[PDB]
Every structure is written in structure tokens, then in C-alpha cells.
Write a protein that binds this ligand. Structure first.
Ligand SMILES: [Cl-]
Length: 317
């Protein structure tokens, strides 16, 4: 199914999806570029709800747990059911530069209500103020804290992980760190939503181009790279590009991606290697889907959401 070539042709893109993408492109090309206004101003504009996209409401159910990290306290954002059936450890996207733990409360609340999972979203340090390995260090600190304390805090030891884009990257990096550095392979499932797994940039990431500002341009990836990775690094390092890693004994994973995404190849490649290492692996490909398409209205996003939430719910009983 996800390798049906028809899935990748223009004909498979619904009228609704094409129209949404066209409007998003226009919206983004009309508004000031984030790289033109600079990082801090771009964050500040999103903060006061002034960005291309309308602000995202915060849940009154959200509460915060400060845990210790290498660079100080790390904020863990919590949305919990009355009786948690497990934990969803979540990492926001934003190219290791933008986004926040409190930037997607509606989604987290939806996940928690449907799955019965307590959602824990991590405020990991952001580049370029705090380049690699700061972000990954904080995500590892969170995962470690959960393994140690989830029973006490939430009355459960069932752990899942997930994230969008750079958050998907971080989810994979964190899984591999927990296995390699701490001998822990106890996560039950991984929700990897259009993540970046090869920071050398896969073919589709290099060739997507900038002529069409559909959420994510090749330019954006190049800028994220410059912020996140010091000159000192080797992008082939498995801690930097999880696609390069030995993937043995990883949890079941769902890879969710649209065909109109610069990072398409990242999900296709990571899926293939995930399966080839002997793990359970599902690839869900959505025709015409933009990068970040699951946040938008419309039937295509709704279908991806149903699939992802059902995937997470599976690991609870
Ligand atoms: Cl066609």
C-alpha cells in the first residue's frame, strides 16, 4: 500500500488537500520569513500569537513537573487521565530551534483522552542558543526520569514515545540512547511523525527546493542544520543521524508521512531499516500530505490522526 506508485502521483491528491496546501503556501509566502525576522523575534511572534498560524490554546488540565537536567531544570508538561494506562513521552517539532512543550495542548489532550495515556511533553533546550547535544541530552534526561519515576507519579510502567519532525528525530535518538547508554529497551511503542533521520539530508530533503513554501523548505533544513549542529560534528554519527544506527531491539513503530514532504525519504528509509532490523514497523503514507499535515483540518489529516491514536491505544489494555 504505501509503496503503490499511484499514491505518489498528482491524481491521488484530493481536491481538498490540494486546496489546503495551496492556501498554506500563499499564507506562508505572504507572511514575513522566520529567517528574515530572526530566531528570537520569530519565537516572540508565535508566543504572542502573531505568526502565520493562529495561536494554539493551552489546556487548563496541563500541569508542569520540573526535573533536573544537565543545563538546569527541564520542564515536563503533563496532561493526564484520572487513571493513566501508561505514558506517552512526546517531543515537539521545530527544527531543534522553534516550538515548545506547551505548543500543542489540543493534540496532547486528544491523545490522552482517546488512549488513556498520560502525555508528557518535554521542554528540551533549543538551538542555536543550545546546540547539539543539548536537546538530546534533555530528552534523555526526561526518558531516564520517567523510567525511574513513572510508577510513583502515574501508577504505570507502560511507556511510549513519539514526536513530530525534529521531535521524531529526538524520539529515535532517545530510544537508541536508552538502549546503548543505559541498557533499557522497555518502551512499548514509537509514534514517529514525519521525522528527520538523516541529517546529511536524504535525496527528497535536498531536492524539495524553496520555490514552494509548503511549511518546510530545503532552505529551512539548511538553516536548522547551521543552528543545531556545530562545525565540529560528523553528520554520519548515529547519535546525530539515527538512520545510521544499529536498530536492533527497538519498539514497534508507526511512521506517518505525506508525499508532499521534503522529509519523505527519511520516513521511507527509517521504516525500511526499522523493519530490516527485526522490529515491528508500519508505514502510513498520505497522498499529497504536506510536512506537518496532521495539524491541519481536512479528511487526510483526520485519517492520519485516527491511525496514530489507534496505534498508541493498542499498547494499553
Ligand atoms: Cl497525475
Amino acid at each position: 500500500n504505501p509503496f503503490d506508485p499511484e499514491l505518489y502521483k498528482d491524481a491521488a491528491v484530493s481536491a481538498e488537500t490540494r486546496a489546503l496546501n495551496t492556501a498554506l503556501i500563499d499564507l506562508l509566502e505572504t507572511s514575513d520569513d522566520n529567517w528574515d525576522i530572526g530566531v528570537e523575534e520569530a519565537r516572540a511572534r508565535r508566543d504572542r500569537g502573531e505568526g502565520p498560524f493562529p495561536a494554539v490554546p493551552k489546556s487548563p488540565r496541563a500541569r508542569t513537573i520540573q526535573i533536573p537536567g544537565k543545563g538546569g531544570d527541564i520542564a515536563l508538561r503533563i496532561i493526564a487521565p484520572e487513571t493513566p494506562k501508561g505514558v506517552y513521552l512526546h517531543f515537539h517539532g521545530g527544527g531543534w530551534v522553534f516550538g515548545s512543550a506547551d505548543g500543542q495542548d489540543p493534540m496532547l489532550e486528544r491523545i490522552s483522552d482517546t488512549t488513556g495515556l498520560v502525555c508528557v511533553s518535554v521542554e528540551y533546550r533549543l538551538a542555536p542558543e543550545h546546540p547539539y547535544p543539548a536537546g538530546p541530552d534533555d530528552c534523555e534526561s526526561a526518558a531516564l526520569w520517567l523510567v525511574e519515576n513513572a510508577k510513583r507519579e502515574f501508577g504505570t510502567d507502560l511507556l511510549t514515545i513519539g514526536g513530530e519532525s525534529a521531535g521524531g528525530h529526538l524520539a529515535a535518538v532517545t530510544l537508541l540512547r536508552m538502549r546503548d547508554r543505559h541498557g533499557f529497551t522497555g518502551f512499548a511503542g514509537a509514534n514517529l511523525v514525519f521525522g528527520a533521520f538523516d541529517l546529511r539530508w536524504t535525496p527528497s530533503a535536498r531536492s524539495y527546493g524553496n520555490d514552494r513554501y509548503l511549511i518546510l523548505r530545503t532552505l529551512d533544513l539548511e538553516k536548522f542544520d547551521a543552528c543545531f549542529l556545530p562545525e565540529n560534528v560528523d553528520r554520519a554519527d548515529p547519535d546525530i543521524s539515527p538512520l545510521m544506527a544499529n536498530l536492533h531491539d527497538m519498539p514497534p513503530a508507526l511512521f506517518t508521512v505525506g508525499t508532499d514532504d521534503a522529509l519523505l525519504d527519511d520516513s521511507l528509509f527509517m521504516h525500511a531499516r526499522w523493519a530490516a532490523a527485526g522490529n515491528e514497523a508500519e508505514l502510513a503514507v498520505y497522498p499529497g500530505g504536506a510536512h506537518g499535515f496532521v495539524a491541519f483540518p481536512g479528511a487526510l489529516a483526520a485519517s492520519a490522526v485516527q491511525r496514530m491514536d489507534a496505534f498508541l491505544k493498542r499498547f494499553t489494555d
